[PDB]
Amino acid sequence: IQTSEFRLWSIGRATENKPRNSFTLMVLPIESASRDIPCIWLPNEDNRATPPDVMRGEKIAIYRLGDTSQFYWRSMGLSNDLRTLESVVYTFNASLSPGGNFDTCYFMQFSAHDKHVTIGTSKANGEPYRYSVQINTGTGAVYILDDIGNRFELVSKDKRLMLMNADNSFVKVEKKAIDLNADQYIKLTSGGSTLELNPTEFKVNTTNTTIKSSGTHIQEAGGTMTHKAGGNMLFTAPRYDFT
Amino acid sequence: IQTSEFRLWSIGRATENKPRNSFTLMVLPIESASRDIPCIWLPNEDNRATPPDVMRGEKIAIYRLGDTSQFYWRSMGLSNDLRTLESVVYTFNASLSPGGNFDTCYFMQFSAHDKHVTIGTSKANGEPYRYSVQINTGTGAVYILDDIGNRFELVSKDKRLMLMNADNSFVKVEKKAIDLNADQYIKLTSGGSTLELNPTEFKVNTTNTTIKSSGTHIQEAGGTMTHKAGGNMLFTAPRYDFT
Amino acid sequence: IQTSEFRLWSIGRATENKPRNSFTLMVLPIESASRDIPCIWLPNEDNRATPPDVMRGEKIAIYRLGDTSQFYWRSMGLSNDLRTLESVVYTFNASLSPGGNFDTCYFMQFSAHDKHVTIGTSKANGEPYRYSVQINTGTGAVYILDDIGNRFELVSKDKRLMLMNADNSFVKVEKKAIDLNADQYIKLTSGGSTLELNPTEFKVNTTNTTIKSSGTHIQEAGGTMTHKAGGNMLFTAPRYDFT
Numbered sequence: 001i002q003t004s005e006f007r008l009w010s011i012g013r014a015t016e017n018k019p020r021n022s023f024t025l026m027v028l029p030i031e032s033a034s035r036d037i038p039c040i041w042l043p044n045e046d047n048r049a050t051p052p053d054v055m056r057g058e059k060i061a062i063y064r065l066g067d068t069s070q071f072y073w074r075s076m077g078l079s080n081d082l083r084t085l086e087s088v089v090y091t092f093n094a095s096l097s098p099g100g101n102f103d104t105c106y107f108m109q110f111s112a113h114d115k116h117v118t119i120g121t122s123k124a125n126g127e128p129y130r131y132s133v134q135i136n137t138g139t140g141a142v143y144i145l146d147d148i149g150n151r152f153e154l155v156s157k158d159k160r161l162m163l164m165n166a167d168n169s170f171v172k173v174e175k176k177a178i179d180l181n182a183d184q185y186i187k188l189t190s191g192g193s194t195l196e197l198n199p200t201e202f203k204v205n206t207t208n209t210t211i212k213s214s215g216t217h218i219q220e221a222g223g224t225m226t227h228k229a230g231g232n233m234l235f236t237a238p239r240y241d242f243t
Numbered sequence: 244i245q246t247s248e249f250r251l252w253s254i255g256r257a258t259e260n261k262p263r264n265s266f267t268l269m270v271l272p273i274e275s276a277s278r279d280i281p282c283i284w285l286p287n288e289d290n291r292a293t294p295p296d297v298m299r300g301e302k303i304a305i306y307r308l309g310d311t312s313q314f315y316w317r318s319m320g321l322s323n324d325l326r327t328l329e330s331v332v333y334t335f336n337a338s339l340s341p342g343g344n345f346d347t348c349y350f351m352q353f354s355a356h357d358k359h360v361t362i363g364t365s366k367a368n369g370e371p372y373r374y375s376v377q378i379n380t381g382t383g384a385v386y387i388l389d390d391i392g393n394r395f396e397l398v399s400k401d402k403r404l405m406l407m408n409a410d411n412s413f414v415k416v417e418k419k420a421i422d423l424n425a426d427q428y429i430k431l432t433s434g435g436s437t438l439e440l441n442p443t444e445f446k447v448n449t450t451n452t453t454i455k456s457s458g459t460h461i462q463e464a465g466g467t468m469t470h471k472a473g474g475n476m477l478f479t480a481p482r483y484d485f486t
Numbered sequence: 487i488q489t490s491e492f493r494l495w496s497i498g499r500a501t502e503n504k505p506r507n508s509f510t511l512m513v514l515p516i517e518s519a520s521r522d523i524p525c526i527w528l529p530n531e532d533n534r535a536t537p538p539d540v541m542r543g544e545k546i547a548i549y550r551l552g553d554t555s556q557f558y559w560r561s562m563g564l565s566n567d568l569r570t571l572e573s574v575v576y577t578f579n580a581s582l583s584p585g586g587n588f589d590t591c592y593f594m595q596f597s598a599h600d601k602h603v604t605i606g607t608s609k610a611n612g613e614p615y616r617y618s619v620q621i622n623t624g625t626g627a628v629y630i631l632d633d634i635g636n637r638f639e640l641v642s643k644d645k646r647l648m649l650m651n652a653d654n655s656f657v658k659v660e661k662k663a664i665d666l667n668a669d670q671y672i673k674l675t676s677g678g679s680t681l682e683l684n685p686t687e688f689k690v691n692t693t694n695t696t697i698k699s700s701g702t703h704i705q706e707a708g709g710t711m712t713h714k715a716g717g718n719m720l721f722t723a724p725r726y727d728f729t
């Protein structure tokens with residue numbers, strides 16, 4: 001019966017917490033047939049760039065190639081209740097040349113250590129822009145952004161939701177205030193009616209205009225001021241004063 | 244040739260649909276060497292909290308530790324066309340103490356049963372806020388929100404997209420209407436020109452103001468009304484009436 | 487010692503780049519005990535619909551059922567540095583009937599080949615709407631949309647962020663301009679003050695109105711124009727002209 005020389009050699013227990021940036025795991029074999037074995041990571045799945053953040057005492061499957069010193073460790077997924085901080089990166093390469101820092105792959109990263117969840121893309125295959133969808137749990141924010149300045153923003157400590165583009169035009173909802181900003185113009189359109197604000201003008205073009213102030217009304221011009229009516233012009237007040 | 248006592252014992256077939264909240268699976272061994280075996284879940288991958296939603300008749304790999312009664316079941320991924328409703332939770336623990344309801348982990352959940360896709364974070368390691376990015380397929384919505392009231396919203400039955408913060412400031416795009424609301428002020432800025440609306444004021448500060456009405460123009464003040472011009476003030480109408 | 491007839495038969499090397507839409511992989515066994523073997527995909531994990539985009543020379547585990555011609559290939563995850571373009575689809579079925587094009591499942595897809603990252607849902611189990619959260623790296627955009635016209639948009643080449651609903655109401659932030667559009671009305675609310683624009687009206691209802699123009703002020707009506715003040719009406723200018 002032909003069987004590969006590469007086989008499950010012994011069930012084991014991790015003797016140490018795997019260091020975050022390490023692929024080696026010290027494992028103690030616990031089957032009756034120093035005492036630790038330095039094992040190389042054997043992934044449970046493809047497209048996972050980081051080994052599991054194995055804690056001391058987790059059940060580990062130790063694989064061995066024949067009688068050689070090539071030992072491998074595979075997480076068995078039976079000791080999840082031991083996990084503390086976990087950071088996992090799933091990578092999907094996006095370059096014609098192989099080899100590879102996330103510069104040549106699309107990825108999704110859950111990092112408790114660095115306190116973010118991020119989906120990011122790369123510019124290694126003709127893509128014009130890079131993107132990131134990030135939940136930043138450290139500062140407290142959700143971002144949707146490219147690499148040229150366009151950004152959706154939810155920032156919790158400032159109670160801010162914002163639509164911001166690369167030209168500093170934005171719609172900002174921060175606390176009890178809303179701020180719109182645009183260097184060329186801001187225009188409201190409803191049917192045939194328009195209201196525009198631009199660096200030199202405030203323009204309204206509509207059918208009927210009604211400006212009601214329960215208190216005072218003030219309109220002041222540094223230059224000339226014109227009132228024009230195709231129909232009758234009406235003034236109603238207890239008295240009229242011309243300075 | 245040393246080999247672990249823990250080995251693939253027999254290929255089998257699931258005899259029942261696995262109940263959603265169960266880790267045990269009844270499996271019938273189908274290799275010639277009651278008839279069902281209660282098996283414990285053996286995961287194919289780490290960071291998966293839920294066993295596959297195995298349907299009756301799926302090919303199952305039955306593992307066994309030596310001659311003991313410890314039987315384990317592993318989905319082989321060769322019977323995907325039998326799947327009906329699936330709910331899968333990937334968890335990434337985010338607490339210094341181990342052990343663990345999603346209160347101590349970042350996670351991503353695809354649930355056909357509960358009709359949502361959700362990416363959520365936890366507040367178990369000093370994070371100031373929790374977050375959720377949810378596609379709610381039951382009610383019909385996409386949400387981006389924290390746990391204090393800041394929210395992006397796409398709600399389909401109401402044709403609503405909204406930016407809403409914890410102070411009830413919002414930019415609402417619902418059906419054929421747009422509503423902006425902010426308790427302190429709403430300000431539009433374009434260059435040196437500003438338009439502000441606040442609880443007691445409507446203020447415009449610009450260079451040139453043009454208000455054209457194809458129909459009627461009405462401005463009414465409960466108190467005083469002042470017209471001021473540094474240059475000539477012009478009135479043009481077929482007739483003028485002072486009440 | 488009972489062991490399944492289905493076992494790891496030999497470690498091997500992929501002889502060819504797996505074609506994107508293929509489940510078969512030509513593998514050369516490299517254990518001493520034509521020369522290629524057509525193997526069927528054996529997944530490393532459940533809920534993965536696409537086999538890994540295996541490149542020539544990757545280490546492959548060849549499984550075999552007994553002495554039969556049923557050979558299977560499993561990616562070992564030890565040759566990731568050979569990956570070039572990768573497209574991976576994780577599927578989560580969402581239909582009461584089994585069987586299945588993404589029409590009956592929720593899914594998440596990372597595709598370097600087609601240049602997008604997409605989370606999508608289906609309408610096979612009573613869901614009223616389908617959804618997609620897509621990073622389109624080809625055109626350069628992030629979309630959040632349903633299947634009836636509601637859409638959040640980040641489009642990089644146009645420097646556009648937009649909230650757009652099925653009735654063509656939108657808040658558009660494009661380059662140096664902001665455009666709001668709504669067929670019924672656009673209303674700003676701050677406390678008791680309101681500013682509304684609708685197809686026939688421009689309405690302001692506030693306490694105090696101040697319209698300051700450093701240059702000229704023009705208000706023109708095709709019909710009548712009325713000025714009403716409950717208090718004194720004041721005119722201040724170097725001279726007044728009635729046409």
Ligand SMILES: [Cl-]
Nearest residue numbers: 021022023024
């Ligand atoms: Cl290492």
Ligand SMILES: [Cl-]
Nearest residue numbers: 043044045052
């Ligand atoms: Cl793994």
Ligand SMILES: [Cl-]
Nearest residue numbers: 040065070564
């Ligand atoms: Cl080697």
Ligand SMILES: [Cl-]
Nearest residue numbers: 101102103104
């Ligand atoms: Cl990379």
Ligand SMILES: [Cl-]
Nearest residue numbers: 172179180181
């Ligand atoms: Cl501001």
Ligand SMILES: [Cl-]
Nearest residue numbers: 264265266267
């Ligand atoms: Cl159970």
Ligand SMILES: [Cl-]
Nearest residue numbers: 286287288295
């Ligand atoms: Cl599994």
Ligand SMILES: [Cl-]
Nearest residue numbers: 078283308313
């Ligand atoms: Cl046990």
Ligand SMILES: [Cl-]
Nearest residue numbers: 344345346347
């Ligand atoms: Cl938890």
Ligand SMILES: [Cl-]
Nearest residue numbers: 415422423424
């Ligand atoms: Cl409202």
Ligand SMILES: [Cl-]
Nearest residue numbers: 507508509510
């Ligand atoms: Cl095929």
Ligand SMILES: [Cl-]
Nearest residue numbers: 529530531538
């Ligand atoms: Cl796989």
Ligand SMILES: [Cl-]
Nearest residue numbers: 321526551556
């Ligand atoms: Cl078969």
Ligand SMILES: [Cl-]
Nearest residue numbers: 587588589590
């Ligand atoms: Cl499908």
Ligand SMILES: [Cl-]
Nearest residue numbers: 658665666667
């Ligand atoms: Cl427009």
Ligand code: NA
Nearest residue numbers: 050053087088
């Ligand atoms: Na890690």
